[PDB]
């Protein structure tokens, strides 16, 4: 897997170039916002169960056919698999947020996920709805705008990390 | 690509774990040591032509037999390839300093270097001479800060030990 620094290195390696001053400055900005990035990851992981459960419950509430017979969340086994998949997707999104790069998420969760879901009959629309609810909740937790849970952080702007979380979830949705 | 971030995320993923206090702490170590290793990378990246030239000159001075026919560097093109190889290694060291881990070196210069150099009759001692000269050539605080020097010499010692 790649992190942000290794991503910059891979881009530099394509031209046999040493890591340039601009890429170095971008990585120094990544480092300077490193504490905010750690706070964002902490916000996501400290609420991971609530995020995943809320997303799956909202996906089911907006699509009641999921829990009907023949629906893909019908039995307790399918419900547990759906919650586990939501947790896995959130875990790899948090991995991407910690790394600053999408490589871990893509290669270790999104590679073959669409084909696997097609083979299993997992509805892609409901999956992206759950992923988007996870995106909204995780973004709120990054921004500390969750209504029922506030985490103390130094005042500041984490919109870049919020956009990173949204972009990782969007990569998940676009993969499937 | 071995680094602090990739190592702890790989450990978390192997156990199927969300990032926890230990992973964030290791990334904090990334934040703390990044200043020194990125200073070393910037110095190397901005001065790699001279450093590579000096390393290659030291390699050929310590092993003039490389110029003899049938040896590595018995043609001008092969000497240029030797300096290009030292360039490759110095660039991989710059990548390792930027990354904060030996991953770039491990995957791009070390992984198959034994078989490549055995097949092409390239003695590892010549590369070792270039890198040992580079490590001993670095002066503090003339070229780098103390900790930047620590990181740079650590990468150089890592590649030397990969060749030893």
């Amino acid at each position, epitope marked *: 897997m790649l992190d942000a620094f290794s991503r910059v290195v891979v881009n530099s390696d394509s031209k046999a*170039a*040493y890591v*340039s001053g601009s890429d170095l400055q971008a990585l120094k900005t990544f480092i300077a916002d490193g504490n905010k990035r750690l706070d964002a990851v902490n916000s996501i992981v400290s609420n991971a169960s609530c995020i995943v459960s809320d997303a799956v419950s909202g996906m089911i509430c907006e699509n009641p056919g999921l829990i009907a017979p023949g629906g893909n969340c019908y039995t307790n086994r399918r419900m547990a698999a759906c919650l586990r998949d939501g947790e896995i997707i959130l875990r790899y999104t948090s991995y991407a947020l910690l790394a600053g790069d999408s490589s871990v998420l893509e290669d270790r969760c999104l590679n073959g996920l669409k084909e696997t879901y097609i083979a299993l009959g997992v509805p892609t629309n409901s999956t992206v709805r759950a992923v988007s609810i996870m995106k909204s909740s995780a973004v709120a937790f990054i921004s500390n705008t969750a209504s029922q849970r506030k985490m103390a952080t130094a005042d500041g702007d984490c919109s870049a990390l919020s956009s990173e979380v949204a972009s990782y979830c969007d990569k998940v949705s676009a993969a499937i | 690509m071995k680094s602090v971030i990739t190592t702890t995320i790989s450990a978390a993923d192997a156990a199927g774990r969300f990032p926890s206090s230990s992973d964030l702490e290791s990334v904090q170590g990334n934040i703390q040591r990044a200043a020194s290793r990125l200073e070393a990378a910037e110095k190397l*990246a*901005g*001065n*790699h*032509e*001279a450093v*590579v*030239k*000096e390393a*290659g*000159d030291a390699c*050929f*001075a310590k092993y003039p037999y490389l110029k003899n026919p049938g040896e590595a560097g018995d043609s*001008q093109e092969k*000497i*240029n390839k030797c*300096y*290009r190889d*030292i*360039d490759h290694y110095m660039r991989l060291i710059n990548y390792s300093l930027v990354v904060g881990g030996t991953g770039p070196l491990d995957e791009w210069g070390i992984a198959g270097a034994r078989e490549v150099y055995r097949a092409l009759n390239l003695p590892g001692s010549s590369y070792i001479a270039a890198f040992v000269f580079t490590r001993d050539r670095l002066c503090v605080p003339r070229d780098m800060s103390a900790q930047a020097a620590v990181e740079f010499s650590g990468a150089l010692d890592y590649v030397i030990n990969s060749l030893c």
Partner: single-chain antibody
Amino acid sequence: EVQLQQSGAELARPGASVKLSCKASGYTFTSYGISWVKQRTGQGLEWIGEIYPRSGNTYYNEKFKGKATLTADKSSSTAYMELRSLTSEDSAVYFCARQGYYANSQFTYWGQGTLVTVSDIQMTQTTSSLSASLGDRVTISCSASQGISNYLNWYQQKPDGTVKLLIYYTSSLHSGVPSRFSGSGSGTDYSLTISNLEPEDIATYYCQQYSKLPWTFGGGTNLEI
């Protein structure tokens, strides 16, 4: 072929800044560096600094640090020297030369030379002026302050002012140099030998070590017939 066209002679005032130019053609700009050499009126060559456009890295002689600033434009394949705080000491002819990377670190091709108005290895050329006749075998010898490793270049500076690389690595002839020229030396002492002298060989000859930065030239030997 390689040309390295330079900008025209620029006149300035003390305290002002001059942005010299050197447009490169006939080769891949990023495969070589651009070195700048200062030559005062009737004096020897002096390496200002080198820039490698591939990385943008600049290496300066300590005597010209802040005084000269090296930049390059890969899109236009040109290099710039920016002189700051101009004085009477900066009145000289400034050359741009194609610089090789690692073992080919030679000023292979020079510019016409832009005239501007208002621990180092010491390269000593003991005989600053030599006189000979056609067909003579003249020897131009120079010494290095410390031991170099055959990393010596010889340069022919015509009375017109153009500079050409004659011999690199102490023995290797350049692309267009006839076999009449030869070089020798292994340690600190090196010699340039011209056999069967011709009128085209009337020039000033400089030996340049590239063992250790900063690159340093010899004082120069003027050869007249």
